[PDB]
Amino acid sequence: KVFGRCELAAAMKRHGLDNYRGYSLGNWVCAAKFESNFNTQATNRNTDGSTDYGILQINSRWWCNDGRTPGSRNLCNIPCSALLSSDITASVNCAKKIVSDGNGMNAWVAWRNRCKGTDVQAWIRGCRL
Ligand SMILES: [Cl-]
Ligand SMILES: [Cl-]
DSSP states (O other), rough: BBHHHHHHHHHHHHTTTTTTTTTTTHHHHHHHHHTTTTTTTTTOOOSSSSSSETTTTTTTTTTOOOOOTOOOOOTOSSEEEEEESSSSHHHHHHHHHHHTSSGGGGHHHHHHHTTTTSSSSGGGOOOOO
């Protein structure tokens, strides 16, 4: 599924991401925009053989099992394919674990490089939330 901007914001709000660990909703929508262009099916392969999955580009070396990342830790206890569903619940639940692990949203390179320190509230502007 390719979400709309406000569609994703409301789905993320419903799943408790607004202000989760202090990150307002605009941060999550901005991260998903630049990580995956709001596409739940986005996958990108990394040089280390790990792969990023889904709307928040969650990585197979640490967070999900994709059967082909040796030394994966599967800390979200899910197959990476679950992260590609049109239901974002598994992505959201795993992202909460990621953002809680010490480094906040700096775990998402696109958030660090393209959302952090910008007016992330612009990403939910005009949405019925
Ligand atoms: Cl915001
Ligand atoms: Cl980037």
